[PDB]
Symmetry: D2
């Protein structure tokens, strides 16, 4: 499962541990019980969600491989209850890959210049900065220092391991109109994968705990 986001980004599911039944089992232990039947365990997940019993969902875990603009990764990395490993700018020569907003991105705003022109000015800086970047490196300048001229729309990559509860906290904040449109798109891809792996939890989440808005109108 690899979903393309923006012009060169993506969200890819690397691994997963457990499913909806992992949470049912975890929660049953409190009552010294185990699993029962579909409509029973399905009903439990709904009960847990509607009453704020979040811990059982911590037993479901995902590992994603994500490609995204640094300005997006900076917001993303603010989520502390998860694990990260990202491409290093001091240890690797960075690739010429930047997020160039589509002209449609400015749709809904009165601008003095045409969207196409905006798109042009951004690319201009990008090409100029990257050119400066390579020149510095070829001149013997350390990579960790040369990359400081690169803009925030530069694409980075990282692995993200997070449990289902933290993932839902993530969705409440990023799968929402108040978050920047760009990370909203990534949150959609995360939600789609989460739905595929934990349908019962996802549904119960949208129905009883989700606090954002976009997931109620969009599909998957």
């Amino acid at each position: 499962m690899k979903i393309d986001i923006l012009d060169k980004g993506f969200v890819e599911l690397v691994d997963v541990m457990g499913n909806d039944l992992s949470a049912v089992r975890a929660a049953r232990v409190s009552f010294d019980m185990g699993l029962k039947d579909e409509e029973r365990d399905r009903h439990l997940i709904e009960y847990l969600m509607k009453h704020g019993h979040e811990t059982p969902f911590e037993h479901i875990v995902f590992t994603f491989h994500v490609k995204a603009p640094i300005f997006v990764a900076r917001q993303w990395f603010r989520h502390r209850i998860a694990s990260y490993n990202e491409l290093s700018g001091r240890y690797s020569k960075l690739s010429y890959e930047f997020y160039i907003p589509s002209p449609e991105r400015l749709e809904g705003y009165k601008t003095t210049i045409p969207p196409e022109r905006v798109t042009e000015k951004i690319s201009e800086i990008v090409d100029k900065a990257y050119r400066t970047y390579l020149e510095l490196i070829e001149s013997g300048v350390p990579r960790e220092v040369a990359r400081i001229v690169l803009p925030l729309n530069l694409y980075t990559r990282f692995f993200w391991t997070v449990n289902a509860r933290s993932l839902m906290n993530f969705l409440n904040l990023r799968a929402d109109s108040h978050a920047q449109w760009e990370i909203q798109q990534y949150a959609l891809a995360i939600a789609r994968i989460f739905k595929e792996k934990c349908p019962w939890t996802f549904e119960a989440f949208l129905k009883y705990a989700y606090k954002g808005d976009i997931l109620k109108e969009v599909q998957v």
Copy 2:
């Protein structure tokens, strides 16, 4: 990474319920920083020892385990102090607890010259435990709320819980519990955890024991 079970103490156990990833999971995560991926067994295994040597612990957070543990409360209280993990435990306020208590064996006193025979100690612990539990059943039978009746049950009462923890946090756990300074009872559980860890992540475990393990019993 599907199933294993080890019995601890007289009625306890550590059972592996699930696992996500393996040694290569850490290799992949670490390589991303250099914009690379997996290489060969030789180079990849070399990286794991390299990470361990210089204390690059983040890559190992991508390896996750879920255990199902049965242990006495005094052990659980020590265990639960490890904050970077997830738990769900049997509830004394919601369910009727069973007559299961950890009774130390006479050998648990080996090295300690006691006034009364060790067997005597074992017997006296069983006695108090039996009395407390009978009082518990009596209060429950008489309508006393479960959450109140259980307060008379002793610390060696067995409890059960699910524990999800990543490899990095697991190694932190072993540095502290797989050590002669930790209480013997929890050392036993730590040894079982180490056995399952070793089985699921040979390279990581081996590198851990050789370059990072701080304890003295593994």
Copy 3:
């Protein structure tokens, strides 16, 4: 500031860093007068912006029964240091519920009688403990016969945001009555040190019930 809880417990403030203004200042980095500042706090509280409150921290000294502490310690976003039963000799102090504790419940055994059976078990258990210790049994082993109502003490450092999460879960009728009592005390001290943040909490974020009543 100290508050007695149950029959022999307590919660006392040891230290605190910051106040309502600490949250205002931290949130002001993203982008005054009492009016504008307090309005900001209600604004942050209203919209779920919890991070600014993490810059206010408390340290409590708590005395409570182990069964209460076991629930309390499940709150991971905080720091703890508790008395050790394997290193020090344990004191003869247990929580004996008052007869009023079983109020509302129709029990075959009179509430006063229930209270007595608990004290009885506690007494016998503690004697066995001392008996074992004097026989040469190490403390870490002898203490396993002691009941869950044994009192313990610990230091608790927690930020305002985490404290509010604690109040949502423990200052509620669903939580066991015993810990509800401690949560009330915790809330009282929080109110004293952070009135604006506290008022805004009850008004827009607090999910429990008892703080709206008591």
Copy 4:
């Protein structure tokens, strides 16, 4: 206490709870005696008993380039609040390495030339940013053309234990030079408020190299 770092940054102490005795009170779980207390602090540090130190907490106000903040924010056991490029118009403040930053490296061009090149692109990027803003382009979007050396500001609340882990990782020759500088400033303030913990830290637990060199 405010220490300047790099060319336009700084580390400033906003608040602090407790001192060395706070870890002592916590470890004993009670409530003085310098000899005893200091000995205990050393004992704890020597045998890996770090929890008592979580009871000492600092709040800093930091100004640093984004590439530095991105490394800094990787420290999860702490609290942050940072200036937002989505809601605020950003100021023309960037970190321009001095020619001295590249002394010790064989470059095919004079260090001053690297300074000029970095500053030129920075200047062009900012001008575009301003033109985009004036044009009505949203801030959250207009700022994506701004380079990684843009200065940001944030409040950082962290306990002494977590602060020591930060020092271990950042106050070390392996960490990028720029964050090393911030780590030194953090250490000085820490040493100022908790002299006993700091000395015990360097003596028994500190894993980095630089702090045993440059004093305070």
